[PDB]
Design a binder for this molecule. Structure first.
Ligand SMILES: [Zn+2]
Ligand SMILES: [Zn+2]
Lengths: 225, 225
């Protein structure tokens, strides 16, 4: 199959947001494959993080090479496609629950020169990604309810990851929510190959070591597939 | 009267948002009286800037002394009072157009230990501020339409500032929108004593010089009142 082999994308929300450029560089210097940037508009989820203006500053600072995956937890994803492309995002991961026209939105993301991610919240059945799997670059199975503080990793989401992996062997599948050295085993064995992790990396004196561990656990499961 | 002296609060949206702490420290080291932080939720205005998690990082870096004025351009300002108070905001400036119960919000802001600001956009008659002028710490008369890039300063907003100053000699009155060395005379003469400016200060080589100029022009007007 053509699934990408394991990628680790640190989430930066638990980083020092007052020094976000330096934090990102630290993640990339520790071996991050991509940067997972969580954008929340206070409507789709009960929190407000940052929008395309922060993204543009980050792009000016880091240059063109680093890959930015925008996790768009916003209620009108159609509205931010162009501003994010102009800001320099590489991938636009929108929520199935935030539009009535996913098809048109996928076309617009592509028309704007970005890769397409499609995410689903815990209550949304995995079956609803099926008609879109072959038309996207990456699927995101969330493993916490977004926008809430201090949510435990949800083991009962793994059947969604396994079902996606079984039906679409070449789809890139991301997990996002409480993923760390302990929960990554379950995510990898279930089929996920794109790992988002935040506090487990940000709490460490040695983020390179934590990213290595995540990638290595992910790989050992992927080589068995 | 008890109108505060002249105060300059740089706006930081044209700063390097990937180095926001360093940018705020530079403003403070340049004589800024406060920091004016524009919060936009992508609904009340067509832009998403940043929320309380970024304010919390800023407060942790800069310590307890600097004063943060939150310009809350959000559709549900009731929702972010407690989160902003916990993040360490000093003043919460909400928009009169963003609520049908300004009275209860003013109380809630004060219960959460913050100063109270009340803002009106250009299309909103200044008469609508009057019932609340004595009950707030600061009124904000916006001098551009919020949410759009590169808007010209609106000279036709000056009569709103003057009416406010005449009716409420002890009220602190803020102007926000394309205010700089070339428009500050008009704002001061009209009656404004809190001056928010962006690029004119941010992109200067001598930001202390620009802050001093803005305060000095403002004082020359204030002395004649
Ligand atoms: Zn995310
Ligand atoms: Zn403002």
């Amino acid at each position: 199959g053509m699934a990408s082999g394991c990628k680790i994308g640190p989430s930066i929300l638990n980083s020092d947001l007052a020094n976000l450029g330096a934090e990102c560089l630290r993640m990339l210097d520790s071996g991050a494959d991509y940067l997972h940037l969580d954008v929340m508009d206070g409507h789709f989820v009960p929190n407000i993080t940052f929008g395309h203006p922060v993204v543009e500053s980050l792009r000016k600072q880091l240059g063109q090479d680093p890959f930015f995956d925008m996790h768009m937890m916003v209620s009108k994803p159609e509205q931010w496609v162009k501003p994010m492309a102009v800001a320099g995002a590489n991938q636009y991961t929108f929520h199935l629950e935030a539009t009535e026209n996913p098809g048109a939105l996928i076309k617009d993301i592509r028309e704007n020169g970005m890769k397409v991610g499609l995410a689903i919240k815990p209550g949304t059945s995995v079956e609803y990604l099926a008609p879109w799997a072959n038309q996207i670059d990456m699927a995101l199975v969330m493993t916490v309810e977004p926008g809430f503080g201090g949510q435990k990793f949800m083991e009962d989401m793994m059947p969604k990851v396994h079902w996606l992996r079984t039906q679409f062997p070449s789809l890139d599948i991301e997990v996002d929510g409480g993923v760390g050295p302990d929960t990554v085993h379950k995510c990898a064995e279930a089929g996920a190959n794109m790992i988002v992790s935040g506090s487990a990396i940000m709490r460490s004196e040695d983020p390179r070591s934590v990213i290595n561990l995540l990638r290595n656990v992910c790989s050992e499961a992927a080589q068995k597939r």
